[PDB]
Amino acid sequence: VQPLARDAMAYVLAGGRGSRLKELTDRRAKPAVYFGGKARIIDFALSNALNSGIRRIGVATQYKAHDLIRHLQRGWDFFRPERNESFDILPASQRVSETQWYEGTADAVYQNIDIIEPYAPEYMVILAGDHIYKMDYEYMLQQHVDSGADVTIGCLEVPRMEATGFGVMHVNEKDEIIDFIEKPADPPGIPGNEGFALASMGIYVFHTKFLMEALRRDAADPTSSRDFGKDIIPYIVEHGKAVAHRFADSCVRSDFEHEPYWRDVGTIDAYWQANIDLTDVVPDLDIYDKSWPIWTYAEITPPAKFVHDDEDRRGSAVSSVVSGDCIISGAALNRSLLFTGVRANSYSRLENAVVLPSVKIGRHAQLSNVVIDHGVVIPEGLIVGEDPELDAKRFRRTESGICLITQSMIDKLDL
Amino acid sequence: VQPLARDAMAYVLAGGRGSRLKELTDRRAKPAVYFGGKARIIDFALSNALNSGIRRIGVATQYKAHDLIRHLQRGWDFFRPERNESFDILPASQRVSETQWYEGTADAVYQNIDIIEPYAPEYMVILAGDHIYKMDYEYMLQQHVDSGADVTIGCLEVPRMEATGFGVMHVNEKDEIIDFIEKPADPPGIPGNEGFALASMGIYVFHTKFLMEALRRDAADPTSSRDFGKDIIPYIVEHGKAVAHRFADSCVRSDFEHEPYWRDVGTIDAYWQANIDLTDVVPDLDIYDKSWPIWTYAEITPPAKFVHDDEDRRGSAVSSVVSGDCIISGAALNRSLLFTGVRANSYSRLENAVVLPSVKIGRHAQLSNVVIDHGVVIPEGLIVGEDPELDAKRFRRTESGICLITQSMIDKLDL
Amino acid sequence: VQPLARDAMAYVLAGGRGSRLKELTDRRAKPAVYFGGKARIIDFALSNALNSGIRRIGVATQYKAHDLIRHLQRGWDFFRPERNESFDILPASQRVSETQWYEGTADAVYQNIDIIEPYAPEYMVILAGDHIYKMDYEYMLQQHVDSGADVTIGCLEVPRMEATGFGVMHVNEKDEIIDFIEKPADPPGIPGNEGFALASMGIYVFHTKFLMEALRRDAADPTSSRDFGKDIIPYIVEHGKAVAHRFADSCVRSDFEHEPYWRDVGTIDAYWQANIDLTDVVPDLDIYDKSWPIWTYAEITPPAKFVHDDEDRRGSAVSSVVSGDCIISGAALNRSLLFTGVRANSYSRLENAVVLPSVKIGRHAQLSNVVIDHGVVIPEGLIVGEDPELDAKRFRRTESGICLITQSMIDKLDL
Amino acid sequence: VQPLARDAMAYVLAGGRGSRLKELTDRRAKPAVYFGGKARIIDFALSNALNSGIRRIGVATQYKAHDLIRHLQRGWDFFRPERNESFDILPASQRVSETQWYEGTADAVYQNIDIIEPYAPEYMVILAGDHIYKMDYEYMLQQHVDSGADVTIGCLEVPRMEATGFGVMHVNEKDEIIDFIEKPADPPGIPGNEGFALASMGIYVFHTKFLMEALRRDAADPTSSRDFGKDIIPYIVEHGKAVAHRFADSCVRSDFEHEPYWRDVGTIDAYWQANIDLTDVVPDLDIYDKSWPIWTYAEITPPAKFVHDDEDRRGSAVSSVVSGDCIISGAALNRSLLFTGVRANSYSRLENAVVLPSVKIGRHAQLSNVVIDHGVVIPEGLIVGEDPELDAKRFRRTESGICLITQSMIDKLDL
């Protein structure tokens, strides 16, 4: 009768590079990347934990975590230990050991056992902190204890051709995992439905004392690369009992989401498309749902302003999403998503543009098919999206034509 | 050396009904009326207190105050007594007396002397809670002490004909008040510039001790209507020293405000105009200033959205102010201000509209020169502003052509 | 799978005066009464809701509420609606009606249906706010929906001699209530265990829809006294399905509580006894347990201080519980519980004393078997507990010999 | 007219290792050392900033900051940027440079120019975070600008032989600094009272623009050890204007403090001394002052409890300071100070003990002249303070008899 999230501690791994996001993560880790005009990427796993009733959260950080920690400090600050809530920000530092470096995602939880065990949670929900998805974790916990499993793994059931980019769980008729392959060219199919492969989300449920034992065992193994997926996961499927849990059984979908929503926005094209899709009439992710809300760090911000309307000038937004503190001054917006603080100035135009917080758009500047990094000041009259060769030289251009624009690229500019 | 705001308590009087706002205050006191897509009216005086360094605030409520109290409870919740901060919400109820209703602005402070005295503030800053203005109260505090006055009164410098609607202080050359007149037919001019009169803002500065005795003297006097402006200040300008502080000395102007800003929006016209004026290219009030910020109760809200762009319908806003969680779906907005939560649907038109939170605009409606009440659902196909006689029979239509539209009115409608 | 508390709203009735507590509730309703150097009495039901996972709480107020409301405002302030948390403080006032008074416990929920229904919780948990107990309401919820009952009523399993003063539920072998008796002289027996009676705690679980219906029907019935225990529930035990829930099945006990703990401290002696019992070596209530914590309003307070140790005076405490901000200066404490802020000065003696916050004990004062009200200043040399006739004339003395001491009594004393 | 603290940013340096505190700072930096059952050492400079009206605070950490940062995260979490308040926690990390270790106190400001400049504070208040004192920084702010100084330096007025351990400022008749000596064997006396010397508090006030220049010149200089007291100030006294501000001009003393209070608790003896002095009848520091309060991280804690009172044992405290969540069970306390969470058990005796949080005192243990580290479990029957050579072998024993006791030493124990 007691919900099991009472006794659970969610541990978010937020050291992920997002190196495939190129300059988008040169000054911040992928979990700190803004998304959706809504939150940072990490806020989803944290919000999933919170709405699932997990009141103990630890966050392991590493790669350039100042922005990330600064965000966690100010957004996730409403846990009080007298209420058996806790939010531990757990960077790598010269604390319990010199290093200043986690040996791997397993070592991120190893070095901080002395923070976990004073809480003594019954279960530990290990989460990747770099995906955008909503999911009730109480379903995984119940399946975990009922099945007697040694580890329950969150899995996407996706068509097999797309599963070639994932780590894939080979599974029997009982959804017990019997093998794990990293990025198979021909992924094993689900028995009885071979067109789909089970695709690891990086979400692992254990019994805490079990994980602590398996985790110290890995800390002493020199064969181990100190990775959950590559070391902890294979040992248990081989010697213990690992059961896959399918994302669709615990996904939390609003009435306006036609299918379970999951995005890893690993590439520039993936990130741009996941954001620009929200300007659809019927987007795949409902950012206006209040049933499974996404908590984030937010400030009181003035509303958005649209100014000028004559023969030469008009500030307006069509097929677009516009956050607060955005002054659209004589600028024409179309199929674009703007975070807070954007200043778009007269005669400028934005199209297919994902504009991160506090960007300025100078007069006459015209930008199409772009991701504009936080705080970029676009010079007056700059054209992006007309000349592919000149665009590829000046900025990071994907093969599909999306230009990522950072301030370091703008500083380097002439003709 | 020390700033005097350290030892000041701001006491906001927020019981005023605001009856000239008609049905706009039928469910809420005027200090709780939304304004500017920015805050409630009360928040300005409260934020002037905050920004002036006054960390002890009391608010007297009375007239329909649940909405008011709930906003105060959820927005102004960051004061801790261990830091010598307090925020007291003081409604008339069954506490120190039966009654359950203050008999005036002076009674509103007098009944709560047992709340003030334990704080023992050196100074009292009595504030009208129903006006929109920015002011650094520390200037008034310096002049009150340096002047040795018994009461210091904040006054607007106004052309005399406009002063006909105010309480007016007659002063000598040294800005010492010699007389007070309520709505003088011919207002006494300022010496040396007889083109202007001193119009009282409802802001008084006392020594707390001098104040306490004056209230006690007021509560024993049966000639007194228990009113600060009618009974407390007249007595002092007669038998003691009452000096006038000019708004322009203390007003906080951002670099984008061409003159000191003060509105009382006491009429549906004045309210609509002040809101609509924020849609100007260069507005008189700069709601994007951060140097003198307006705190209010804000929640995390999704951004604004504009959808549809075909030959027949296009969602967009021009010369407009739009708040978060507004979905503008195939609807046209022009010179309109929208608060949070508005749903405007296909082929509807807004012009010169002030739209309060959570209003739904049905398909094909066309509204012009309107103030729409909070949460109002506008039926599909409604027309306002085309037929003055039709509009006046259905809604509170002003002589100037503004229609105040409540859900009470909508519910009564056929043709 | 999902815990039912997610879909519940706890509604706490905190209007009861507690008139048998006499002067102790002359200025504050019983739920606001301090208890245990721990919290106020209402802080047990609210924490049960919190710890049980109920995130929406309403508090119905009425009798002398200013202290209670100020406490809820400042202590219970960590709920944000974006997380679908809410804490509504709902006093009787000119809101949806003139009244300024609820007509009964049922009416207190009736007049606030417009607060409940926007939340649309699936279940209402109606709670008395004047008892000291720990309880996990998730148990009653799942019992409620699996039994199909129209009401699930929390009941104490007590010796029928003790149920003399309780509203008693008459049940069968299925724990379904046949009849309700208000204070039976000889109360009915549990079938199969007639020596124990089912005593109503005043804790009701409904389906929200059904409760709304019962309450509109009760609101239109003129036979009804608009009370839960006498109108809403007796109707259902007759026409619907009413099943009793027993305290021991859902009581939250720490490993240091030998029996399920519940106290209503309805009398001076009951209140003194429950407080003074926490000075025991093995107390009934474990106020040091952290597993089902009691949240309250608490301020950073300095530690307790004990000074003086010579032949004539020694500040010390024995068999006593001493809060922070207490300075025991040359004063002797024994078997006493002191709330925060007490100053006991030289040569004074406390024995068998419950001392509420901020009391001052003057020099040479000797007090035995006392309840000292909040803020009381005990004059130098006062002797209480030596002469019963003198004590009964000066203060409120129980037949068992406890004197409750208020400041209005002290102010009236010569010899 | 406006207070200068509105335009100032406090920058606390809390990287100090406190090496002379020996094992007491093995696991924590000195600013995180508990003190006085009141707060951590860092909490005094932070509170002086807060109470002085400085709403922007930066804290530089370095040596083992995990406890420190976590304390700042959970304690100093009530600043909001939209109210022009900020609290930046700034450890040396991979952020703007590899390093992972500041080169000194000046470099700890220099490396975070990019944090301060967006705030554009007019003034910088550089504070040492490892001293216990109370001080109204607004006085320094006025002197600095009224003086036209390039840096104002807080100085203690100390008899000359005690200035032997300080950086000492040689001053002229109008308190302008003409020279600075690091630990002068014979400190330069103040002109006119040659019995006293101005000892540096490590408190500096600059104009922000001049400081950031001085930091950048310092960063380009290889002769500079990148430290404020050794490099920044010595440059200024030579080539610019440097003025002294005396601690007694601006120190905030409560009515019960006979002298300006400043302590550096730099040794085990000094640390034990300052804590144990708080058990005095009239202490030098009044921790019960509410006029200049010390904010800290505080949890809701149960009160203190004393139990047993027989022929053989009695739980009591004499001449002692006892925090909440302390259960004194059959233990005798004299002239001791206990932080929260102490558990002292039957037949144990403590005298002149400073007992840090969560310490367990086993039965029959007897300890005198003692500092017990956080969470230490003292084994039953341990005897300390009786045999110096034994104590000094098992423990870190001062020349004056104080033993600092860590769990690492208990773990190694036999006879």
Q: Are residues A28 and A135 in the same domain?
A: yes
**Residues of chain D found within 8 Å of residue C307, distances taken between Cβ atoms:** 279, 281, 319
The per-type count for chain A, helices as H runs and strands as E runs, is: 11, 27
- Rounded to the nearest 5°, which phi and psi values hold at A65? -105, 15
Say yes or no: B93 contacts chain C, CB-CB below 8 A: yes
Q: Give CA–CA dist C287/D324, Å, rounded.
A: 12
Which contacts (CB < 8 Å, 24+ apart) does range A389-396 have? A396/A22, A396/A23, A396/A268
Q: Give CA–CA dist B294/B305, Å, rounded.
A: 25
Q: Give CA–CA dist B368/B183, Å, rounded.
A: 34
Residue C412 exposed, middle or buried by CB count within 10 Å (0-12, 13-18, 19+): exposed
Q: Provide the token pair at B85.
A: 């901060």
Q: Give CA–CA dist C169/D44, Å, rounded.
A: 59
B288, B323, B356: which is the final residue of a domain?
A: B288
CA angle C29–C30–C31, rounded 5-degree value:
95
**Residues of chain D found within 8 Å of residue B139, distances taken between Cβ atoms:** 1
Provide the β-strand partners of residue A368. Answer: A351
Provide the β-strand partners of residue B205. Answer: B125, B152
Say yes or no: A51 contacts chain B, CB-CB below 8 A: no
Q: Provide the token pair at B188.
A: 């006494």
Say yes or no: C118 contacts chain B, CB-CB below 8 A: no
**Residues of chain A found within 8 Å of residue C3, distances taken between Cβ atoms:** 3, 5, 53, 138
Q: Are strands A8-13 and A123-128 parallel, antiparallel or unpaired?
A: parallel
Q: Are strands D8-14 and D56-61 parallel, antiparallel or unpaired?
A: parallel
Cβ of C89 and B81 within 8 Å?
no
**Residues of chain D found within 8 Å of residue C305, distances taken between Cβ atoms:** 279, 288, 320-322
**Residues of chain A found within 8 Å of residue D66, distances taken between Cβ atoms:** 93, 95
Q: Are residues A263 and A323 in the same domain?
A: no
D167 is in an annotated binding site: yes
- Rounded to the nearest 5°, which phi and psi values hold at C188? -60, 160
The 3-state secondary structure of A170-237 reads: EECCCCEEEEEEECCCCCCCECCECCEEEEEEEEEEEEHHHHHHHHHHHHHCCCCCCCHHHHHHHHHH
Q: Give CA–CA dist C15/B265, Å, rounded.
A: 39
Minimum-distance CB partner of A295 among C83, C139, C293: C83
Q: Are residues A25 and A162 in the same domain?
A: yes
- In sequence order, the 6+-apart residues with CB closer than 8 A to the CB of A287 are A36, A37, A38, A278, A294, B302, B303
- 8 Å CB contact between B158 and B197: yes
Closest residue of chain B to C66, computed from CA coordinates: B95
D400 is in an annotated binding site: no
B348-to-A236, B333, B382, D212 alpha-carbon distances in Å: 61, 9, 9, 56
Q: List D residues 131-170 in contact with C (Cβ-Cβ < 8 A).
A: none
Picking from B72, B94, B95, B299 by the largest number of C CB atoms within 10 A of its own CB, the best residue to mutate is B94
Strands (E), A295-402: 304-307, 316-318, 320-322, 327-329, 332-334, 337-338, 343-344, 349-355, 360-361, 366-372, 377-378, 383-384, 396-397
Distance between start and end Cα atoms, chain C: 69
Region label for D86, one of left (φ > 0), alpha (ψ between -120 and 50) or beta (otherwise): beta
Cβ of D91 and A95 within 8 Å?
no
Q: Give CA–CA dist D94/D116, Å, rounded.
A: 18
Q: Provide DSSP, D340-385.
A: TT-EE-TT-EEEEEEE-TT-EE-TT-EEEEEEEPTT-EEPTT-EES
Resolution of the experimentally solved model in angstroms? 2.3
DSSP C229: I
Q: Are residues A327 and A381 in the same domain?
A: yes
Say yes or no: B81 contacts chain D, CB-CB below 8 A: no
Say yes or no: C57 contacts chain B, CB-CB below 8 A: no
Nearest Cα neighbor of C293 from D325, B57, D353 is D325
- The amino acid sitting at C167 is G
B258, B288, B318: which is the final residue of a domain?
A: B288
- In sequence order, the 6+-apart residues with CB closer than 8 A to the CB of D136 are B2, D48, D51, D52, D250, D251, D252
Q: Are residues D275 and D309 in the same domain?
A: no
**Residues of chain B found within 8 Å of residue D78, distances taken between Cβ atoms:** 78, 80
Q: Are residues A252 and A120 in the same domain?
A: yes
Q: Are residues A53 and A165 in the same domain?
A: yes
Nearest Cα neighbor of D180 from D244, D85, D116 is D244
Q: Give CA–CA dist A357/B97, Å, rounded.
A: 54
Looking up tokens 């200035």, which residue turns up? D163
- Structural domain count of chain D: 2
CA angle C48–C49–C51, rounded 5-degree value:
65
Nearest Cα neighbor of B250 from B201, B189, B196 is B201
Q: How close does chain A come to B109, measured CA to CA in Å?
A: 31
Helix A42-51 and helix A66-75, axial crossing angle in degrees, nearest 10? 30
C147-to-C142, C211, C314, D407 alpha-carbon distances in Å: 8, 16, 62, 55
The per-type count for chain B, helices as H runs and strands as E runs, is: 11, 27
Nearest Cα neighbor of C74 from D106, B82, B326, B224 is B82
Provide the β-strand partners of residue C344. Answer: C328, C361
Distance between start and end Cα atoms, chain A: 68
D227, D260, D288: which is the final residue of a domain?
A: D288
Q: How close does chain D come to B38, measured CA to CA in Å?
A: 13
- 8 Å CB contact between B267 and B21: yes
Q: Are residues C190 and C231 in the same domain?
A: yes
- Torsion angle of C-alpha atoms B365, B369, B374, B375, degrees rounded to 10: 0
A111-to-A60, A101, A125, A210, B296 alpha-carbon distances in Å: 10, 10, 17, 16, 43
CA angle D245–D246–D252, rounded 5-degree value:
110
Looking up tokens 């005669």, which residue turns up? A347
Q: Provide the token pair at C327.
A: 């300075």
- Rounded to the nearest 5°, which phi and psi values hold at B171? -130, 160
* A-D Cβ pairs (cutoff 8 Å, strict): 31
- 8 Å CB contact between A377 and A407: yes
Q: Are residues B171 and B145 in the same domain?
A: yes
DSSP C145: H
Q: Give CA–CA dist B2/D385, Å, rounded.
A: 49
Q: Provide the token pair at B13.
A: 């009087």
Which contacts (CB < 8 Å, 24+ apart) does range B33-36 have? B33/B265, B33/B271, B34/B339, B34/B356, B34/B357, B34/B374, B35/B132, B35/B265, B35/B271, B35/B274, B35/B275, B36/B132, B36/B274, B36/B275, B36/B278, B36/B285, B36/B287, B36/B337
- In sequence order, the 6+-apart residues with CB closer than 8 A to the CB of D390 are none
* DSSP H/E element including B206: strand B196-207
Q: Where are the alpha helices (DSSP H) in C52-94?
A: 66-75
Cβ of A138 and C2 within 8 Å?
yes
D368 is in an annotated binding site: no
Rg over CA atoms, chain D: 23
**Residues of chain C found within 8 Å of residue D317, distances taken between Cβ atoms:** 306, 316-317
Q: Are residues A255 and A300 in the same domain?
A: no
Provide the β-strand partners of residue C157. Answer: C198
Looking up tokens 């674009």, which residue turns up? A336
Q: Provide the token pair at C223.
A: 């036979």
Q: Give CA–CA dist C201/C163, Å, rounded.
A: 11
DSSP C122: S
Q: Give CA–CA dist D133/D135, Å, rounded.
A: 7
Q: Give CA–CA dist C1/C142, Å, rounded.
A: 11
Cβ of B53 and D136 within 8 Å?
no
Q: Give CA–CA dist A272/A399, Å, rounded.
A: 13
* C-D Cβ pairs (cutoff 8 Å, strict): 106
Q: How close does chain D come to B246, measured CA to CA in Å?
A: 16
Residue B327, Cα to own-chain centre: how many angstroms?
28
Say yes or no: C327 contacts chain D, CB-CB below 8 A: yes
Looking up tokens 């405290």, which residue turns up? D317
Q: Are residues D83 and D222 in the same domain?
A: yes
Could you tell me the sign of the dihedral formed by the alpha carbons of A10, A15, A20, A24, in that order? positive
Q: Are residues A326 and A200 in the same domain?
A: no
- In sequence order, the 6+-apart residues with CB closer than 8 A to the CB of C239 are none
Cβ of A142 and C50 within 8 Å?
no
Q: Give CA–CA dist D415/D411, Å, rounded.
A: 12
Residue B185 exposed, middle or buried by CB count within 10 Å (0-12, 13-18, 19+): exposed
- Rounded to the nearest 5°, which phi and psi values hold at C248? -70, -20
Binding residue ranges of B for alpha-D-glucose 1-phosphate: 102, 167, 182-183, 200
- The amino acid sitting at B166 is F
Helix D42-51 and helix D66-75, axial crossing angle in degrees, nearest 10? 30
Say yes or no: D293 contacts chain B, CB-CB below 8 A: yes
* DSSP H/E element including D126: strand D123-128
- Torsion angle of C-alpha atoms D340, D344, D348, D352, degrees rounded to 10: 0
Q: How close does chain A come to D327, measured CA to CA in Å?
A: 18
- The amino acid sitting at C103 is E
Q: Provide DSSP, A70-111.
A: HHHHHHS----GGGT-EEEEE---SSSSS-SS-SSHHHHHHT
Q: How close does chain C come to A193, measured CA to CA in Å?
A: 27
Q: Give CA–CA dist B204/B365, Å, rounded.
A: 47
Q: For residue B408, how many other CB atoms are within 10 A of its CB?
A: 13
Structural domain boundaries enclosing D383: 289-415
Provide the β-strand partners of residue B307. Answer: B329
D85 is in an annotated binding site: no
